[PDB]
Structures are given as structure tokens and as C-alpha cells.
């Protein structure tokens with residue numbers, strides 16, 4: 001019943017993930033996003049009924065409220081899967097937000113960064129590893145000031161042993177991946193959060209090529225508080241065991257006195 005149950009609007013974007021369209025549920029009038037994924041181009045499948053991993057992972061996290069975009073429904077077709085997802089309104093992704101406004105005031109980066117951490121914790125707590133945390137995978141609900149994680153298509157079940165496959169973004173990938181093709185979930189996630197935070201406070205990523213990643217030296221082109229630079233360098237420690245846990249990130253001095261999402265919208269987004 002898919003074509004009667006939702007009403008298709010403009011293409012929101014396309015890339016490695018497939019094609020994603022703006023939509024309306026005709027039932028509720030609810031704004032949704034409609035993601036089409038070609039079966040040919042799915043590396044990794046899961047089960048409940050053989051499905052894309054994204055579907056497994058999203059069901060594991062979609063129980064309860066969160067900073068992750070919910071799987072509302074899904075459909076199989078002969079050559080594609082179709083996923084129905086929350087669409088916040090109005091909305092802008094963090095990539096476009098940063099491309100437009102440049103480097104972000106710390107107070108705002110702090111608010112955004114905290115929310116990302118809450119969301120990643122929530123995922124890990126549900127047994128899910130994202131594997132592609134970056135600006136293009138974070139949405140900002142502009143009215144409520146709430147960040148939501150998207151695109152679980154490179155994700156895995158969380159586990160405590162090493163991962164030897166990676167299908168996320170190279171410049172967000174830790175040096176242990178680049179040199180040895182091995183990493184552990186949590187410490188690789190922390191590396192990529194280090195990259196994210198630098199991107200927030202400088203308006204751009206710290207490392208462009210592999211040689212820079214491997215070397216792991218951070219130069220700041222923008223004025224950034226010494227507390228913030230400390231946290232960034234800590235998350236981008238070359239040795240994974242030298243990186244902080246999520247607990248240590250959230251207890252870090254730069255993370256004190258976070259604004260609530262609502263107060264963050266009033267000040268920085270309205």
C-alpha cells in the first residue's frame with residue numbers, strides 16, 4: 001500500500017546512502033523522509049526476513065524518545081528497500097549549517113556536541129554502533145534546538161572485539177584504521193567525535209589526507225578556548241587507550257553548563 005499511504009515531495013538528497021525524499025504521511029499528515037536503498041548497493045544485511053542492517057539497527061534504537069531519527073515503517077520492493085523516517089520541520093543539517101554560518105560560538109558547539117554525545121550513548125546502550133558520525137549525519141530541528149543522528153547504513157552491532165571492515169568517511173576515520181585496518185567501536189567513535197568538535201569550532205575538518213591523520217597534530221586557524229583545544233586533542237589521541245570515555249568527555253571542564261536545546265534555539269537559531 002506504500003504509494004497511497006505517503007505523499008512524495010522534493011528529493012532532499014542523494015549519495016552513498018541512496019536517495020531521500022521529503023514526504024507526508026496521508027494518515028496523520030506527519031512530515032516524513034523516504035529513503036530508497038538499492039539492493040545491489042547493500043554491503044551488509046541483517047535478520048528478524050533478510051533486511052538491510054540500517055533496519056535492524058534502527059529498530060534496536062527506535063524504542064523510546066531520543067536524538068536519533070526513528071524508523072517509522074519500511075517496505076521491500078523487487079530491487080530496493082524503502083524506509084520511512086521522522087522528518088523535523090523546519091530542519092537543516094549541520095554540514096549546511098556550518099557551510100553557511102562558519103565556525104560556531106563555543107556555547108553553541110557545546111550545546112550541539114553534548115546532544116550528539118547523549119545520542120551516541122543512547123545508541124551504544126541499545127547495542128548499536130553508528131560508524132559515520134560527522135556533520136552531514138546530524139540534523140538540527142531549528143525550532144526546538146534538537147539534534148538528531150541519521151544514516152545508520154554503515155553501522156554495526158556493538159561488540160567488544162576488533163572491527164576489520166569500515167565503510168564510513170575517511171577523513172573522520174581513526175589512525176588505527178588507516179595504518180592497520182583494525183579498530184574498536186568506542187575508541188573509533190571518540191576519534192570521530194574529536195573530528196566533529198574541531199569542525200564545529202573551526203568551520204572545517206582538521207585532516208585532509210592520510211599523512212595528516214597518521215601524524216595527528218592539530219593546528220587551530222581560529223580562536224578557540226584552551227579548554228576546548230584540550231578536549232579536542234584528547235579525543236584525537238593517536239593511541240586509542242589514551243582517548244577519553246564518554247563519561248570523561250561529559251565531565252570535561254569545557255562541557256560544563258550546557259544550555260538546554262530550547263534555550264539554544266532562542267539565542268542561536270531564532
Ligand SMILES: Clc1ccc2c(c1)N(CCC[C@@H]1CCCNC1)c1ccncc1O2
Nearest residue numbers: 012013017020033085086087091093150151
Ligand atoms: Cl530531513 C531528513 C530526515 C531524515 C533523513 C534525512 C533528512 N537525510 C538527509 C540527507 C540529505 C541532506 C538534507 C539537507 C541537504 N544536505 C543533504 C538522510 C540521509 C541519509 N540517511 C538517512 C537520512 O534520513
